[PDB]
Design a protein around this ligand. Structure first.
Ligand SMILES: Cc1c(C(=O)C2=C(O)CCCC2=O)ccc2ncn(-c3ccccc3)c(=O)c12
Ligand SMILES: Cc1c(C(=O)C2=C(O)CCCC2=O)ccc2ncn(-c3ccccc3)c(=O)c12
Ligand SMILES: [Co+2]
Ligand SMILES: [Co+2]
Lengths: 379, 379
């Protein structure tokens, strides 16, 4: 059931912006760990006296890393005379965000038909404004509303190159890394109370709700279900402490929990990422027991061959299944110091018409199946 | 002339501590870029609710990366009940340092015979105390005095494993990277006024002074000249703006300018580092013109063969010479967002007795020779 109730025309995820203390070191770590190339910059060398911003890309996936310079470099500026390339940026906000939450996502950016219209309609329907629409070089419009915690939903619209004022990066310093990642599949928030968070976001977007161990969750989706925004709340009083509650404690409240990155070839992506885990890249969660992969034959033996299932076992990949499609997924350990944000790598099999959004679900069946494999393997 | 006037027994450089916003991402970037392995940690997994600290090592070189957790995790603690492994750490100080200066060196740590004695004698001779001597697990004593800006000189002494409360890192997650770096050769500060900075530091240590383009400098040295602390001040009114003044502006005042890391094989180190510059590692300053390497034959043709000189040319290595020894050196681009701290890679030839400290000097002749090569090459 898809009522197609979007209150404005939404296209696709556009970019994710991390707020950092040092953008250079985070961007370089992420580039090597994920196989993303440096493609654009806005910093002192481009005339930006306010913030350092570096853009990594892999396919359609765009990760932006931003950190503030000393306010003294721009102390004579006012907003009419700013050298910032992202006019919503504020030194105090960025320092407060990072000191409160540590390294994490500040903005989930979606491309829309008209960012000024999206902003107006959103706030008319309950959105809390964060940054008003600003037109950049008569070419791009950007606006921001609060999503949850200190995370903003950023609207970007183009009349007709990331953003004005960004320069493309010299071909000596943009090595063409590529481990197969191609786009953002979904972006997940953790909140203390799911109900009020859903009502708020579905309230101002018109996004609809998409089709025992820690959490309750629900997924909001755009008209073609290509923008997917799951939200989790903790379940208290359980035997094992809710990882959602641990997040909220270490993050100082609500924020973005994980980014799921679609791979065109999850086996290649995981081979390449795992080669680099101990040499500057990302670590992965502990692999499931072999009983999990023994049990895969009964669950997805019609979708994956034996060789492809044992390849899942080598790489620690999880598998889950909808009534419509199949999902391969795996989770990294937290991206930074705090047990807060992590990354999911995903590939979806089925639902071909192009592939429809959310094919195979989000892997919620893997909570039960992981547990079952734990006990089964223990014997 | 070495008066051997140390007011307490100093051994060697012990470690350098960076204060970070996210220790994980900086440590992983540095590990890959410099070929240092993860060897110790103190963080949530070791019971530290206050700060995340990760130690990288290469030979005798020790780089420590530290960042604060949310104060809420340790809000019930007092100093008598702290879970911090570094008792001098303070959330407010660390956040203030990073917001003021960005990523940079907080502590230059030297091993001494008796850190409590070193502290007492230092402050009796004018040192500004920063953290009093604290004995850790009856095994290690640590104390801190102000060096310049917000950089501290840290004294560490051992009765008889980095620090108590640090755990050695699992052998799955400590890949044995090694590009040839072996120890810290010197650590350099930038100050607004050289005279008062020298008088202060030489005042409380008894370190002695060791043997047209931007700066004045002088070098303070311990008795055996193995702890070497150069200090620079800007020279104003010059044609090209002083890089020392640019540092002071972007850093919000005095601080550590560069760390010089001795390599047992600078050609191997630079081959390995340059292979990684565009895949998460460090960039190097622009190479000198070929006239620089043509002129090397007349200057050091008795020390380096033609093949070894052209190998210097491939890697962009600089060469300078004392009356006593020869120096090979090269400088990275800044380590983070701001044009502040950078790294020097160094190897010294000569002065064998073991090799005496500072053999060949610090390369000050390369200001003139670089310039000369610039004009000569222009024709
Ligand atoms: C994170 C996740 C998902 C997931 O992507 C997800 C969404 O995208 C939206 C709905 C709710 C949700 O959780 C699905 C299944 C999972 N199964 C297990 N674990 C897990 C494994 C090991 C140790 C701790 C935890 C997960 O984190 C996990
Ligand atoms: C940094 C440095 C040193 C150096 O280590 C050093 C000390 O260890 C103590 C004494 C003063 C001093 O500068 C020596 C020679 C150099 N020559 C050139 N440049 C340089 C090249 C290119 C673009 C800007 C600058 C340097 O940075 C440079
Ligand atoms: Co997910
Ligand atoms: Co030097």
């Amino acid at each position: 059931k898809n009522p197609k109730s979007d209150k404005f025309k939404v296209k696709r995820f556009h970019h994710i912006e991390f707020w950092c203390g040092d953008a250079t070191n985070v961007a370089r770590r992420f580039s090597w760990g994920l196989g993303m190339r440096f493609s654009a910059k806005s910093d002192l060398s481009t005339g930006n006296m306010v913030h350092a911003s570096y853009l990594l890309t892999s396919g359609d996936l765009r990760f932006l890393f931003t950190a503030p310079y000393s306010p003294s470099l721009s102390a004579g500026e006012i907003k009419p005379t700013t050298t910032a390339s992202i006019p919503s940026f504020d030194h105090g906000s960025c320092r407060s965000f990072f000191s409160s939450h540590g390294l994490g996502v500040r903005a989930v950016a979606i491309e829309v038909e008209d960012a000024e219209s999206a902003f107006s309609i959103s706030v008319a329907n309950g959105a809390i404004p964060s940054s008003p629409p600003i037109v950049l070089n008569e070419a791009v419009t950007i606006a921001e509303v609060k999503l949850y915690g200190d995370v903003v939903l950023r609207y970007v619209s183009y009349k007709a190159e990331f953003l004005p004022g960004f320069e493309r990066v010299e071909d000596a310093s943009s090595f063409p890394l590529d481990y197969g990642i191609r786009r953002l599949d979904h972006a997940v928030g953790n909140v203390p109370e799911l109900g009020p968070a859903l009502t708020y976001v579905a309230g101002f977007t018109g996004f609809h709700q998409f089709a025992e161990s820690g959490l309750n969750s629900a997924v909001l989706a755009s008209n073609d279900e290509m923008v997917l925004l799951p939200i989790n709340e903790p379940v208290h009083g359980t035997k094992r402490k809710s990882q959602i509650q641990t997040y909220l404690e270490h993050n100082e409240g609500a924020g973005l929990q994980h980014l799921a990155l679609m791979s065109e070839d999850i086996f290649r992506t995981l081979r390449e990422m795992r080669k680099r885990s101990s040499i500057g890249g990302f670590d992965f969660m502990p692999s499931p027991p072999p009983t999990y992969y023994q049990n895969l034959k009964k669950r997805v033996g019609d979708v994956l061959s034996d060789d492809q299932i044992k390849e899942c076992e080598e790489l620690g990949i999880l598998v889950d299944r909808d009534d419509q499609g199949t999902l391969l997924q795996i989770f990294t350990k937290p991206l930074g110091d705090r047990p807060t944000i992590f990354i999911e790598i995903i590939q979806r099999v089925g639902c071909m018409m192009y592939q429809s959004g959310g094919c195979g679900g989000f892997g919620k069946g893997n909570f039960s199946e992981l547990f079952k494999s734990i006990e089964e393997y223990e014997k």
